[PDB]
Amino acid sequence: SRLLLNNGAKMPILGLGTWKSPPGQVTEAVKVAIDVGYRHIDCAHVYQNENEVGVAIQEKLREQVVKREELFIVSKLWCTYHEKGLVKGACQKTLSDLKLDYLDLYLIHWPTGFKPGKEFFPLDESGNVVPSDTNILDTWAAMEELVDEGLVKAIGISNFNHLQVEMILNKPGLKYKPAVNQIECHPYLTQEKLIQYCQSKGIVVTAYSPLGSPDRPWAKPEDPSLLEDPRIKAIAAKHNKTTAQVLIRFPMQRNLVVIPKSVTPERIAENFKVFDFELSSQDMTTLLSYNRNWRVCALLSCTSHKDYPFHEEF
Numbered sequence: 001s002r003l004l005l006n007n008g009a010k011m012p013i014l015g016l017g018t019w020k021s022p023p024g025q026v027t028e029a030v031k032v033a034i035d036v037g038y039r040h041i042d043c044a045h046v047y048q049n050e051n052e053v054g055v056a057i058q059e060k061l062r063e064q065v066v067k068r069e070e071l072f073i074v075s076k077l078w079c080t081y082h083e084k085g086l087v088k089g090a091c092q093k094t095l096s097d098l099k100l101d102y103l104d105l106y107l108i109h110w111p112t113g114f115k116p117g118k119e120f121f122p123l124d125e126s127g128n129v130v131p132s133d134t135n136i137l138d139t140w141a142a143m144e145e146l147v148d149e150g151l152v153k154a155i156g157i158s159n160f161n162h163l164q165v166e167m168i169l170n171k172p173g174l175k176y177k178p179a180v181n182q183i184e185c186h187p188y189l190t191q192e193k194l195i196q197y198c199q200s201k202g203i204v205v206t207a208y209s210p211l212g213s214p215d216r217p218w219a220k221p222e223d224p225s226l227l228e229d230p231r232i233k234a235i236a237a238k239h240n241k242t243t244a245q246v247l248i249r250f251p252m253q254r255n256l257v258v259i260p261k262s263v264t265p266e267r268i269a270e271n272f273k274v275f276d277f278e279l280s281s282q283d284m285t286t287l288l289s290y291n292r293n294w295r296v297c298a299l300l301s302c303t304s305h306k307d308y309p310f311h312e313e314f
C-alpha cells in the first residue's frame with residue numbers, strides 16, 4: 001500500500017497521473033480519484049494544468065474527505081528552470097497553482113537544462129533546442145535548499161540514467177539523497193538494470209507510462225499497443241481482470257510506485273481495483289520476457305544535449 005522513503009515519509013504505491021489531462025476535465029478527474037481512494041497525484045508545471053488540479057485538492061480538503069497529511073503530492077522542475085536562482089521561483093509557482101504550502105516530493109523532471117525563457121522548449125534559428133550551461137550537481141544543490149526552507153519534504157529525480165544518479169550520490173557535501181527516480185516502465189521497457197541499481201542504493205522507483213501512454217501526441221498506428229497485446233490479454237483473462245489492471249499490478253509486485261493517468265471516472269475507479277489479486281511468479285517472469293527496449297518518451301529533440309540520459313545502456 002505504501003513505500004518508505006529515505007526521509008521517513010510513506011509514499012502511496014498507486015498514484016494518479018495528469019499529463020495530457022485537459023484543464024477542463026482534470027478537476028473532475030482528481031476529485032473522483034480522491035473519492036475513490038487515490039492519495040497520490042503526480043503533477044508538473046509543464047503539463048499546464050496545476051491550477052485546475054489544485055482546485056480539486058482544495059475542494060476535497062475543505063470537504064474533510066482527506067486531510068493534507070494523508071495526501072502525497074508530487075511535482076517536477078522543468079528544464080528551463082535549472083539554474084540556481086530560478087529553482088525556488090519555479091517551486092513557488094507550482095505551490096500557488098496547486099494552492100499548497102509544501103510538496104511531498106519535487107523532482108528534477110529531466111537531467112537536461114534548457115535556456116531560461118517563456119518557451120518550454122526554446123529553439124534557435126536552425127530550430128534545435130538551446131541548452132543551458134548548468135549541470136546536474138548545481139541544480140541538485142538548489143533542490144537541497146528547498147528542503148532546508150520547508151517548501152518540499154523530499155526531493156528526487158526523473159529520467160536519470162545510473163551514471164547521472166551516481167554523480168549525485170558521489171557529490172562532495174551531499175546533504176539529501178534523491179528519494180525517488182521516476183522513469184518509464186512497462187512490459188516493453190522493463191528497466192531491470194536501472195531498477196536493480198536504484199533499489200540497491202535505497203532510491204524508490206516510480207514507473208510512468210505503465211499502460212504505454214496510448215494518448216501520447218506522437219503515437220503512430222504501426223506502434224505496439226500494450227493494452228491490445230493478446231499475450232497480456234490472456235494473463236488478464238486468467239485473473240478475471242482487465243489488461244489495464246494487470247499492467248498496473250505488474251510494477252507494484254516489483255516494489256515500484258505506479259502512476260496511471262486517466263480523466264475517465266470509470267477507468268479511474270477500475271485502475272484502483274488492483275489490491276485484491278496477485279500475479280503469480282510465472283505471470284511476472286512472462287511479462288518481463290516481453291521487453292523490447294521500446295520508449296514512449298525518448299526526448300528526441302535533445303539527443304545532442306550534453307546531459308541526454310538515453311545514450312548510456314542504463
Ligand SMILES: NC(=O)c1ccc[n+]([C@@H]2O[C@H](COP(=O)([O-])OP(=O)(O)OC[C@H]3O[C@@H](n4cnc5c(N)ncnc54)[C@H](OP(=O)(O)O)[C@@H]3O)[C@@H](O)[C@H]2O)c1
Binds near residue numbers: 261
Ligand atoms: N517524469 C516524466 O518524464 C513523465 C513522462 C511521462 C509520464 N509521466 C507521468 O506518468 C503519468 C502516466 O503516464 P502517461 O500519461 O504517459 O500514460 P498511461 O497512464 O500509460 O496511459 C494513459 C492513457 O491510458 C488510458 N487509460 C487509462 N486507464 C485505462 C484503462 N483502465 N483502460 C483503457 N485505457 C486506459 C487513458 O485514457 P483516459 O485518460 O482517456 O481514460 C490515457 O489515454 C503521466 O500522466 C504523468 O503523470 C511522467
Ligand SMILES: O=C(O)Cc1ccccc1
Binds near residue numbers: 019044046047297
Ligand atoms: O516529460 C513529460 O512528462 C511528458 C511531456 C512531453 C513533452 C512535453 C511536455 C511533457
